[PDB]
Structure formats: structure tokens, C-alpha cells
RNA sequence: CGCGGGGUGGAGCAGCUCGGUAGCUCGCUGGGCUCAUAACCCAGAGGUCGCAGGUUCGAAUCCUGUCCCCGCUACCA
RNA sequence: GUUACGGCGGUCCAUAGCGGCAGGGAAACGCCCGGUCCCAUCCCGAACCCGGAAGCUAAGCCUGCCAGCGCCGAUGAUACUACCCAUCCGGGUGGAAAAGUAGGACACCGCCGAACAC
RNA sequence: GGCGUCUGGGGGGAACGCGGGGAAGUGAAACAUCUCAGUACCCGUAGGAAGAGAAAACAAAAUGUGAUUCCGUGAGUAGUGG
RNA sequence: UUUGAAGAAUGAGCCUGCGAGUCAGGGACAUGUCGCGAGGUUAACCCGGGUGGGGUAGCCGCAGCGAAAGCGAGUCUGAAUAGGGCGUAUCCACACAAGAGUGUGUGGUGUAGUGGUGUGUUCUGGACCCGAAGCGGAGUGAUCUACCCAUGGCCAGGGUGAAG
RNA sequence: UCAAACUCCGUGAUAGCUGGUUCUCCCCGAAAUGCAUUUAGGUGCAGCGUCGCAUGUUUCUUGCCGGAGGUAGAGCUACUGGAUGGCCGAUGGGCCCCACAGGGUUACUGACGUCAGCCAAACUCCGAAUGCCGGUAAGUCCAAGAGUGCGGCAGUGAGACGGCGGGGGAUAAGCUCCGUGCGUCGAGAGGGAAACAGCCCAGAUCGCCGGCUAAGGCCCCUAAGCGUGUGCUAAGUGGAAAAGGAU
RNA sequence: UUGUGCGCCGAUAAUGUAGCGGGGCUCAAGCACACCGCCGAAGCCGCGGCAGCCAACGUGUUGGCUGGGUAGGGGAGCGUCC
RNA sequence: CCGGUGCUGGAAGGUUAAGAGGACCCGUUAACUCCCUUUGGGGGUGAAGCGGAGAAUUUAAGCCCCAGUAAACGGCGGUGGUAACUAUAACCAUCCUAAGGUAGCGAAAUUCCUUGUCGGGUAAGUUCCGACCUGCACGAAUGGCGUAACGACUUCUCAACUGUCUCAACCAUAGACUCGGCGAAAUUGCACUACGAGUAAAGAUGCUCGUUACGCGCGGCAGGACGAAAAGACCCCGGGACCUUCA
RNA sequence: AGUUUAACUGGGGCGGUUGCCUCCUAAAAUGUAACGGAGGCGCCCAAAGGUUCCCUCAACCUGGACGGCAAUCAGGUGUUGAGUGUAAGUGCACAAGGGAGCUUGACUGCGAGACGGACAUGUCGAGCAGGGACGAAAGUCGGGACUAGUGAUCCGGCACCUCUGAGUGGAAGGGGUGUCGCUCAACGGAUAAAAGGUACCCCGGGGAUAACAGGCUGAUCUUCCCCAAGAGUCCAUAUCGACGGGAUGGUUUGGCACCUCGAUGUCGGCUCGUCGCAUCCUGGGGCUGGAGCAGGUCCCAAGGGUUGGGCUGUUCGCCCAUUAAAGC
């Protein structure tokens, strides 16, 4: 109604974009644990196959379901909760 | 001719918002005022504009003290 | 020119900043106040001409 | 249809509020020059823009009714 | 436990106040005596503060007497009033119900302490 | 410059193409930036297709791809924008 | 169309025909339905005399928070274990903290999207239909009319009577 | 045809403007308000409708309870202001003692104070009823087809009259502007009001050559009573009207 | 002389009675107060039919409530053509 | 009247574009180096070159500025007092101006008041003529004042003339009327389209209560059908167009 | 050449206004309109903020040197009438008013919960921490007794930041945090940038909105009337009838804006009339300050009649002659 219209009344939200941005398909341990119940070798093309990322992406692993089996995980990044979940439960996490 | 009249101010929406028995939170408006018309007391504080505000749960509880017109919180006691 | 201008009180000890309002008309530029900064504590702020 | 607008010594004009309003010319009064005006000297004298209100301490000064001759008043069909 | 009592509080902070006219000084409250000390006056030991105990309940404080001034104040009635009835009557119903007035209402309650009692 | 001779052009054509020129209504609830739109229209030119085309390119540290054009995606994104 | 029209407000002479929410898009949102299902789906394109079969490039879901670096069921702010924001599908049970509105941990249950298609709104388009005055581009027009150029023609009769 | 010709094209120009928009039935059912607007005859959002989903009586009504208000009314010696009459009497004006002061005295003004009576939207020592907020117990409860939240789809955003409270206006307007869990029309037929959207009654599912009623009416038009009883009226009052006049 | 219930005057426009809707009404068909009946609607009831919502019971009947309606929303359908 | 705005001329100054000019600064880094410990890595300085930002200085017109110009656009005043009756004011004072409207004209094609006043003409003259000047709001090439002649101009008067009129009558002709023949039109929601007083979207053929009215035509009149025609031109809103300008 | 040149508006224009705050209107919650009634704001204060402590005025009376009503001094009365930075209101004497000391909380990070709420805005906020001020301590302090004292977004500037850095290292530029720049005052702010005319006009619309007429109202106007102070030699009422008051009518100027703007043609005249009576003449009558003639005033009466000319567009009016009269 010739009203400042609310997407000029208000302000443009902050920051920038970033786009030489890492974004990382993630996957969580404990879909790796429902995936692999029997555990074994787990790379991008394995969790690919068991459809929990995308192909032709940069994969991170994250700790938010419990682990119990042996994984030699193979992903670019690992957090922190990740890794500690993977070794205890006895497997390896390998970053390429 | 004209008017040199006209104008208004906008209403403040000034009074009591919560009235006696009223179950209210900490930190509640109870009382939108621009003086002590309603003056604080138990559990209750006053803001910079004169506003009344509950310091704790209760029930609003109008009474007097000293003349003043006031405003307590009286606890509900939990069963 | 205003008489009551934004006179933005820096520090010393770090030059960041806290703004307010003074008179121009007072005698001097200089409107030593102590002011909590972000980055130290407590110190002595003055009147970036 | 309706709106608008400055006032101050006797005359004509100035002067916007740090707390007074006043000043100029003419006029007038007294004196002097002259045998008797004009021109000279002043002790020169001279006013509350009317009352109400200021935030007033106080308002010529600021604000409103009044203070009132005021330039513009103009409903175009 | 009793005080003509000293504090700390309370009341829909006036039924409590003001002003009476007659009284009290046990401890206490007080005036009061002095400024050496902490402290203090935009000047002043008046006050604030400190040290004291000469005399005095004169005052404050306290007790009794009160409708003198103020305060409280119903009832009933009236006004006003939501709803209703009513073709103007702002008439009337049933509900609520003032102000003013008038009749009448003059401090009380608690906790601690003091002297005494005990 | 004149004379002679020879070879050719000239104009048309619905659309498409290449290069140039280039509006305004409109939208922005006004309007000028902007849009409409490099549209319409115009000009010059073709060919059966044209143009472009064989890196003074992309890319990003991958031992990378390897002329150009076109299609789809990328994406109504990054960005651009009174 | 109006507060309100039988209305003396509009429109309609009558009949017959014609005459207005449509279409496109992997568009957006919502909903229904179908398929599959933590996956769904292909586009261009290829092969098919078809409506069929291939086609993984991409797209949407699958982890969020943050300006971002980045971290990650956490993250941002912040000096903070100190609170808040957003998020951790949801629910159940237990336990512990609290009763400032309930929270925190543990266990369990375990998360539902996607692509076709219909429908309703919507975006870009003429976008339900009709309707201007007017704007622009390119052209047509001076055989009407205005003015001018060239060349021709016409102005009965009667008077007045300048210069020389 | 000329305040910028005509023709074609752009072009289906754009028009917050006007007009038109075609078959049916069933259920529900508005608004004409707020805010903002180069806005005021448009639009966005909210409000109000519908549909779906979720929740489920939270809604609403009544009783009771707890509450805040400052309206009506009232009051003012309770404030600010206004304001009547008395009383007192400063104050001044005069007079006389006549200076100048200080005195008495007044034909006068007469403040302040006081006695009595009064007024106020912007006065209040007071102060309702209602309404509002909250709680609570019930009611309705095979229904109000409620309320709240989310989302799809809206339309409305020119209101009107009447009752009540009020402003503006001449306390005029069929005036205008507000308020009112006030109504009706709008969008509501039917009956009455002679006729007559907004008044009264009453909310139309259809049918019936059945009955009871409301408002309003019962001499004839016109269905029902020239009803009964007691009075009144003489003016056709009834079946318009004022100050005021009136054996 | 007081108050009251009815009345009188004041009273006064212009197409035609024209300020009861008309006739006509005081032998009230006028006013007041009481009383008695009746008329009177698409209201309510009665009989019947239909639909919507809901409930119950049964795997479609019964019952209750509701059913004016503009903009508008939703639902279900008729007809035409291919 | 050169103050304003223009136009012309001038350029001592002031300001001023691009261009020259490139200081200084910044980025980078060959090289110097400092710690910090690493197996090299983080801080400082920093040449040349390349870049970026670009200051000082110089630089014209224009503008400001200095003069002129009004048959350039334009502009050409107030207040108060004053003469032996009164009246006015030749005269004076004062303020402002760039200058304060001269001659001449003047209730005007200009004068609101206004039918100004006076005179003339007329029986009677808001018009006309002459004159006055109190010029709302004349005025000298947006020319002033006059002017013979001219004018389908405007205004007034007079003679003559007349049907313009008192006041209308008659005749003919073309229509209208009748017969024959051909044969439209605008308009049109309908229709066996009354009047009054009302009511109503506030002016009714269509509603109410009454009154009046046999049915159908022909010639006529024009009061109504808010008659036909033209989507009011005035007004407003919205949008255009063209025009103006110190937008 | 393209365009702008606002809206509200009891039609429009002119005038005025536009945002914020306070009161009344406002109908005792909130809220509530009008070109409704009154005012204020577009700041100020480095203390007029914070904190600790203290005090209580104004007015009046009395006494006091200049000193006066009123300066400062003393005493008394005085519970609030003063003063509160500034409008008003609500409040504040318990002080939020007056004074002194120390100070900078006129902070940083946050904020349970609420108010208000179309949205955007706006408002209060206990409490946690940091590091402080005051205070013995409790505690208070995130500006001011409160409510106004202001401006969204875009864009850009400055400072700081362990963000990003278009191959890499840097840098530019971007980003974050804090903050600045708009009488964008038409104050939810169309553009960075904008005034007018149209009677040469055009189009779309409107009776949503004016002019004519109608309708309502009846201030005004008109026609009467009530009281009767009085003028009238006396005498209120023969006649006029003040101050005041009540009404008719609907013809005047108006108010409203209800039909009509897809058309209701306007003044005056001409012609034709028709109606009312508030009667100009004619007619009838009462009173008279009516001797008579002639009148005045009032009542009844609307049958008929109610001239022609000069001026002016004119209605109206003045004038000329007449008339029984020259009606409204």
C-alpha cells in the first residue's frame, strides 16, 4: 500500500557467503553402525552405496549415534567425537 | 477560519493489566503507570517509568499502607 | 555546529571507544571519565577531537 | 462561504527580549545673534505601542483575547 | 504477673489527630553539665559526635479527664443507575445504590526490655 | 580523364543468420536511473544454412581438461539492482 | 451499482447464433491421489514408425549453528561450566534436580521424503473479457485548405476627374 | 478530423476507473472497523467468513468471590476557578484637625475573613450502577455447530437508520463524528405500521382447503366485539403544535 | 383558591377533501381503568416429505438438533461436444 | 529610474573544468634483519620496478565584479501638519526609494463604492453627451492625447418610414388535412400506461386511501413521461495532451 | 524532449494541518473519531546523572539599619497550597523537593518473565557474571520522578576485530563489532534529483462530490403572537409598543449533500395560465385620540379586477403620466 514494505523496512541480514566454502556431506556414526552391523572397511564409495551421502562430495563423520563395531572409516574429515567413538569401539579413522 | 487545535498524543495503554487474585510470573506487569498512584510492596519493584513488575509468583494482592495505595504478590502455597 | 555534540570518549591504554553526549561550551575538550572497555577493565577515557 | 496586519516623546521614524524603553530629525521650552525669524547654545524638558499572561524576577521586546488606521478578501461555476 | 514506662512494629494510618485542664520521674526516656578524645558546623559543641551526672520533670514522653475543632459514621430516603415495561409522560417495574445530612462513634493490637513482684 | 573491348553487378524473396543503428506505450502502483529491450522498427549483407572455430582458452596446484557450436544442468544460484 | 432503486439511477427493441479465469512451465505454496521409500527422480540425449526401453549429469531429502574461518548434535554470542538464540522429528519409561513456570541426563520407540498426476491460489507472460485519451517507429498525404513559384485568362455599364 | 493529421506496426498499449463474466442444488456465512499508505472510491496486514488439521468446553451465560477505577450523581469551608446576597473592615477617595506626619469622620470603594445559598468536560474531601480483568461452582452440552493454534481460499476495508451515552452544529438537520456481547437493514422474506430498507412482532427446509398465538387489532371497507362494567370528553378532541390566554 | 382528568383558544399556504388510511363514529366505532373472548404471521404446534451435523445401534436404519442468506468459502451434481 | 533581470563592452582582482604536474602516502618485494624455536617461521625495516590514491603549482571562458543601455523586459511612494469664517492646502516636517507617474487624459472599452455629483437631452434616461476628480486599479511606442476621411464595428439621439407594437384581420401559395401509390426514422424493459392527497432513493401511469373514467380512432397543443439525442463540457477524482517558467 | 508539481478537506480552491508528548472529549479497564477543546516538543544537564548522609518548604504573623509588600536575620504558626530543568497530567513531604561529600553504572556480556501489540516500531525487567562508584553494612547504580526531545531501509564513512582474501603469499574490496551521516518535518521515510497553466482542451469515472431545482433543517429571513417599561396632555393596550420571550411559513441568504453528473438546460422577458391568502381595489364590519370629508388599526372576505411608458439584460428599484387599485 506504498507502506515500506517489510523486505525493505527491515535490514539485510549480515555477513557474506563465503563461496570458497568446505562444505561437508556428513554422516553419523551411529548410521555407520546400522549400515555395517557386522563393521568392517567403510569408505565414501561404501557409504555412497549404503546411501548415506552424495557422490562426487567431501564426507565428514560425525558422533552423534553410538558405535559398537569395528569400522576402519576412510572420510576427509572426522570430528572430534568421532574418532574417539571409532578408536573405542577399536576400529581406525583415516583422513584423505 | 481554523483550528489551532488538533493534535493528541498516543495512548499509552497505561492501567492495570493484572487485578487482584490475578496468578502471576516474576517480572509480570502488573501496573503501566507514569507516577505511585499504585505504589510497590511485597514482591513487588518499580521499573524507571513507574511500572510495577512482580519480584516473584503469586497472586496480585491490592492493599494500603500508610494512605499509599499498593500493590503486594501473595505466594500460592504449592499442595 | 551543536552545543551538545556526540563527543565519542576514547581510551587510554588502547584507543577503542564508548560515545555519549556533552556541551560544547564547557571549557576544554577534554572529558576524562573512567569507563569499563571490551579487551582491559576499568580505565580512564578521554574525547578524540 | 472564508482569510488577513503595524502601532513607540507633540508629528514622522528607528530599536527584539545578556534583567529597562528607549534613541534620530522636526517640533516645543529657556537663553543668545538681530532693531525683530531662520542658523547657535543648551541645565534642555518630553512617552507605559492600553489592559491580560510569561518559564516571567522582569519584560516596548515573548504569547495569546483585546491593542486596531493596516496592504492583500479573491469562492472563480 | 502489675505498672501514670522504655523501645521495636502493625491497623482500609484520624474512632488513632489537634487543642484541652489536672497530673508522673522507680529503672528508663529525657532535657541537662562540658568539649580532653572519634566526630562536626557551607558560621556556631545549636545540631551531629564524644565524655559526664550537678538539678528538673519545666518541656518532650507518658497517664486520666473529651463530641471544643477536625476524623469516622450507619439506617431509611433521595439522586444516579444495568435490565425490563411503556406509542413522547424520561413515566414506571424489579435489582444495585450513593454524596450530603442526621442519629451516633474519642485509640487499639502484638514482640522485647526495664523496674518491681517473683 | 577520354576511346575501345571483356568480365561482372543492379532487382526480387516467407522465415532463419551475421554486423550495425535503435524507440515508446508499459512496469517501477508517480518518475528520470532502471525496465519494456537490444524488443519493435530500420540499414547493410548473405548462405542453404549462417556465424563462431583450432587457445595469447579454461582450470587450480588434480600426473587436470584440451577447437567451435548447440542442448540439458549448474541456477532463478553466485551476484547485480534508485 | 448502491446505505438504500419498482425506481424518475445505469444497460437491454425482439429472436437466433457467437461473446469472458484459459494455456505453457521437472515453475511456487497448500491439498488430494498413485508409485517407490531413507531414499525418490531423471533432464538433455540414445534406441524404438508409438505411448516403450535406456540415460546419474543434476535436483530434492539425508545435520545443524555461525557473518565467516570453522565446529558439529551441537553451535553462535561471550572472559564465562553464565545465561540466552537456533538446532538436536516426536513420544514413552526411569532417575536426578527443581516447584522461576519445569529442566538435565540415561535408556528405549525411532524420524519421511521424493517423483508423477488432479484440484485451489499464485509467478512470468495480453493472462477472465471489452474499453481510452494518448506515446513511439516507419511511411502516406498540399487533387480540400494555408502560403509560394511559373504560365494563362477574367473583371458589363456608369461616374469622379490626379499628375503632366 | 488538428494544442501536433492519417495509415500500418509496437499492440491484445496501459487504465487504482466503468461495464460485463453464461447451469444446478447442499452446508456455513461476512464486512463496510483498526493501523499504515504520493493514502483517502485503491491496496497490505490485523479483525470478521469458510475449509482442513490439531486441541477439546478452554468459549459463552448465570450465581458467588477477589479486584482497579473516578463516569453518572453529589459536593466544594476538600483544591483550582467562577459566583449571589448579608456582616466585619483592612485598602484607598473625600472631609475635618486642613502642613508633610499622626489623627478622627465618612454620602463612597470596600480586599481578607466569616454566615447562608450555588456552579464546572479539562475542579474533586467523595462516589455508584454497569462494564472490564481474574478465580470459582454450575448451566448449555446426540450443541452453541462455540473458543484457541496452524495452514489453504477469501471477500470486506463507501455503511445506513433507530434506542442509549456524547462531541461539532443553533444542545437544527433524513446533518456529521465517536462509543455501546445494543438492535435491525445491509445480506432478512412473512405479519402490523394506509402505502413505507433500518420501527414493533417474528428469523421463511418443502407441502396441507388443520390448530394456538405475538405485535397489532375486532362498526363497514377488513378477519375478529356497533363486547361487559364504571367514569370522562362536546372539542369530531380523538384524528399535529408553543409561549401564553381562559367563570 | 390548590392539584389533577379530559377539553377550548393560540392555529396560520399555495393541483383537490387532504393533520382518522376511507366511509362514517359521540345512540362512540373516542379517552382512562378493570374484565371477557376472538382475529391475526412463512412464529409455535399437528400430519407428511427432503437435506445437513451428530449420536446410538447395526455393518443402514432410527432418533435428536439444525436447515433465510449478499460478498464469499466448501461439497455434490445436471446438461453439451470430442 | 540602470536598483532587479537582460543586452553590450571591459578584465584589475576572486572563484573555476579538462589538460600539464606529480610531491607525499599506500600495496607489492630483491635485500637487510629480530626473535621463536624449528627441522624453518612469524615480527620490523625496505631499494628499484610495477601499480593505486593522487596534494602543491599553472591553466580559459563563464560567474562574482567594473561601466553603459529603458521606442530593452521592467518599475515610476507614504505619514502628519499648515493660510484672518469654514474648507482645502500653494507651503513645511519626517521616513523610504533606483526613481516615486511629467505632459496629457480621467466614473474611462479602465471607477468596486456607483444609477458617483452636476449639467444637457427625455414627460420620465442604471444607457448616451459635456464637465468635476475622491484615478478601488489611466498614462506616454505593452505608445499618450487628438484627428479629417473610412467602417456589414460598438453606443446614443433625431427626421422619414412602416403590422415591431397598440392589435390584430384578410388573400394566395408550399406544407399540414383527405384519396390513391411507394414508403423510412430516431426510440423501444414491459403494458388494457388516469387524477388528487400522501408514501417512497426525499418530484410516482405502475405503491396506499380515495376520486374519476364505456371501447377504438382522426386532427391538434406540448404540462409530464425527471421525454429523445450526445457514457455532463461545469465541479471533483484519476490519467493524458499541449503551453509556460528563476521546477 | 521526458516528466514531477502530495494528501486531509462537511465539494474543490485559498487558509490551516501532517510526526512525538500531556489533559479533556472518552460514556469510572484498555482503546475510541472529528478542520473537537487546550498546551507543549524537535532540547537541556559533565551535573540538573549515581550513591551516602542530612534538611523540609511556600504563605502568614511579629520584631529587626539602610530595606521599601517583597533581599538577608530572629522567633512563631504552618503536613504541604511551595518546589519538582522545561508543557500538562499522574505522582512526590516516607520525600522523587533543598543541601553537602565522594564519584562516573550517562558501564561490558546477558536477560527469566511481561506490557503493548496488523506488521515494523516501542516499553518495563528481577536476576547471573565482569570490572567499578558510593556506603560501616545492608544494598543501590545499565542516565535524569515519570511520560515528549526524534527518523526505518538502502547507501556510504570512521575506529577496532585471531572473519574472508576469485591459482598461491599479500593487498584491494567485502564482512563482524561499535558508531556517524537525512526539518527524508507530507516525520512508515515513492526519485539522489522536480514548479505552474489550460476558457484550446481530451479521456476514464462519479450524483462516492459542488453549481440549478427538489428534499430535510429553519440560524437567518418572513408572518404573527406573549409580557407590557413606556411614547401617547392624563390614559400601557386609539396608535406605536422597548427589554425579553414563544411560534408560523418555507419566498431570502445559508447549513446538510438525500435522487439526478451513460445530462433534471440557467437569469430575465414573451405566451399561457393555475393556486393560496399573509386582501392592493371593490364588498361587509368592530374600535378610534372617528365631528364631517378623509383616515388609522383590527376582523371577515380570494367573486372579479389589479394600466401603459423612460432607464437597466435585468428581477428588484427609481421616475413619468394614470388609476378604483396599480397586491404579496
Keep these: ?70 569400522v576402519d572409516v576412510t572420510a576427509n574429515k572426522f570430528s572430534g567425537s568421532a574418532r574417539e567413538a571409532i578408536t573405542a569401539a577399536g576400529g581406525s579413522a583415516t583422513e584423505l | 477560519s481554523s483550528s489551532r487545535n488538533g493534535r493528541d498524543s498516543a495512548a499509552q495503554r497505561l492501567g492495570v493489566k493484572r487485578f487482584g487474585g490475578q496468578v502471576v510470573k516474576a517480572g509480570e506487569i502488573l501496573v503501566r503507570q507514569r507516577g505511585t498512584h499504585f505504589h510497590p510492596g511485597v514482591n513487588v519493584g518499580r521499573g524507571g517509568d513507574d511500572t510495577l513488575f512482580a519480584l516473584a509468583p503469586g497472586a496480585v494482592e491490592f492493599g494500603a499502607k500508610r494512605g499509599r495505595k499498593t500493590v503486594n504478590i501473595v505466594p500460592v502455597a504449592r499442595p | 555546529i551543536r552545543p551538545i555534540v556526540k563527543l565519542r570518549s576514547t581510551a587510554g591504554t588502547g584507543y577503542t571507544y564508548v560515545t555519549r553526549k556533552n556541551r560544547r561550551n564547557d571549557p576544554d575538550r577534554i572529558v576524562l571519565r573512567k569507563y569499563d572497555p571490551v579487551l582491559r577493565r576499568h580505565v580512564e577515557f578521554r574525547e578524540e577531537r
Design chain 1, 1 to 70: 500500500g506504498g507502506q515500506m514494505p517489510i523486505h525493505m523496512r527491515l535490514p539485510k541480514l549480515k555477513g557474506f557467503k563465503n563461496r570458497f566454502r568446505t562444505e561437508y556431506q556428513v554422516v553419523n556414526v551411529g548410521d555407520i553402525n546400522k549400515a555395517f552391523p557386522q563393521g568392517g572397511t567403510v569408505g565414501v564409495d561404501e557409504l555412497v552405496a549404503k546411501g548415506l551421502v552424495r557422490k562426487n562430495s567431501l564426507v565428514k563423520v560425525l558422533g552423534d549415534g553410538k558405535l559398537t563395531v569395528k
